[PDB]
């Protein structure tokens, strides 16, 4: 807290030297719409995985499978920490998110010996649950990495059914303000472009765009 100053060497250009070396050029980046309000995996940086997003099962469909379950619709809880789970979603089987990449490589018998229930076939419906729907979404990509035709996701599984207020606690790794990044410490590029890549026009809390080339607009004047 208390507004720790940063150790990065980004700096705005002065009022004396001319603007030079325009094979790299910073400019401010502002997209069209806001995406901070949305789900985590429908934002701008996860736009390439849009077709990898699992289909959404909602609350009233989850209450329907609570009362009237189907013999091959496997509800699977993808919560990882055993300390943060307190109640049992009905007709659910426990498959933690950290072990999905090793669980789906097992055979039919070895999945029973390592998890206590039968491995689902590749043609049946699989519905994944989590706290906010983040661990179930990452498991849904691993369930779709293997050839499982019907992979579903309930976003906000535990927090809406049981009414809890929890989180999957993804760290979303950001450098500490003592960790100085790469382009200050290194002779990987020449000194003119090193000064110009580290240049930014404005405050360093917003996003920017780096141009790989620029030509002077001679037609204005």
């Amino acid at each position: 807290q208390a507004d720790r100053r940063t150790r990065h060497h980004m700096m705005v250009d002065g009022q004396i030297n001319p603007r030079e070396w325009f094979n790299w050029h910073p400019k401010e980046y502002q997209p069209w719409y806001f995406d901070r309000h949305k789900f985590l995996y429908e934002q701008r940086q996860y736009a390439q995985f849009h077709h990898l997003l699992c289909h959404q099962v909602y609350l009233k469909d989850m209450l329907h499978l609570m009362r009237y379950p189907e013999p091959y619709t496997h509800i699977i809880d993808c919560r990882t920490s055993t300390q943060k789970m307190h109640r049992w979603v009905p007709h659910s089987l426990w498959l933690p998110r950290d072990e999905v990449e090793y669980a789906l490589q097992l055979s039919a018998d070895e999945f029973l010996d390592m998890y206590g229930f039968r491995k689902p076939d590749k043609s049946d419906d699989v519905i994944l649950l989590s706290h906010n729907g983040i661990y179930s979404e990452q498991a849904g990509w691993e369930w779709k990495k293997q050839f499982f035709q019907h992979v579903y996701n309930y976003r906000g599984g535990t927090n809406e059914l049981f009414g809890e207020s929890y989180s999957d606690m993804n760290v979303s790794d950001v450098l500490s303000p003592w960790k100085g990044p790469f382009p200050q410490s290194g002779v990987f590029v020449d000194k003119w472009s090193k000064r110009k890549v580290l240049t930014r026009t404005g405050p360093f809390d917003r996003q920017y765009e780096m141009q790989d080339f620029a030509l002077p607009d001679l037609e204005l004047e």
Partner: peptide, 16 residues
């Protein structure tokens, strides 16, 4: 160990 404000499984469990 949690006391929630709203609950959706609990009214379906009590009548059953």
């Amino acid at each position: 160990k949690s006391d929630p404000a709203v609950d959706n499984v609990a009214p379906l469990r009590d009548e059953d």
